[PDB]
Swiss-Prot record:
Span covered, complete protein: 27 to 150 of 150
Name of the molecule in the record: Ribonuclease pancreatic
Keyword line: Disulfide bond, Endonuclease, Glycation, Glycoprotein, Hydrolase, Lyase, Nuclease, Secreted, Signal
Leading EC class: lyase
Disulfide-bonded cysteines: C26-C84, C40-C95, C58-C110, C65-C72
Family assignment from sequence similarity: Belongs to the pancreatic ribonuclease family.
Function of the protein: Endonuclease that catalyzes the cleavage of RNA on the 3' side of pyrimidine nucleotides. Acts on single-stranded and double-stranded RNA.
Binding annotation for substrate: K7, R10, K41, P42, V43, N44, T45, K66, R85
GO MF: lyase activity; nucleic acid binding; ribonuclease A activity; RNA nuclease activity
Source species of the chain: Bos taurus (Bovine)
């Protein structure tokens, strides 16, 4: 139903906005991007940069992934991101999230040819 690359865009990109638009941003985006369809995905990051600027990271600093493979890349500088984390009270099917705006490096796992982001590993 989706390539890794398209899934990454749906789960992690929001180039339209420079930052989260309200404290309810994560509630709205986790629902609209289909991340609460089957379960409340507990953690998710959105990146407020252009697709070209995030794709560029696959040519930046190579680092180990959390799974121990080494197809991860850390951006040389920091990016506007919004981190979403499900609240302690959230229960499917009324999934609820805290929204945190931040400016941090991103680490992404890259795959394919063209070699592009497919997983969001971490922010730092």
């Amino acid at each position: 139903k989706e390539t890794c690359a398209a899934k990454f865009e749906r789960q992690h990109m929001d180039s339209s906005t420079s930052a989260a638009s309200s404290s309810n941003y994560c509630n709205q985006m986790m629902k609209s991007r289909n991340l609460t369809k089957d379960r409340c995905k507990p953690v998710n990051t959105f990146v407020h940069e252009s697709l070209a600027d995030v794709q560029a990271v696959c040519s930046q600093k190579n680092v180990a992934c959390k799974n121990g493979q080494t197809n991860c890349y850390q951006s040389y500088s920091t990016m506007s991101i919004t981190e979403c984390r499900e609240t302690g009270s959230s229960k499917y099917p009324n999934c609820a999230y805290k929204t945190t705006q931040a400016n941090k490096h991103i680490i992404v796992a890259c795959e394919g040819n063209p070699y592009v982001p497919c997983h969001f590993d971490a922010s730092v």
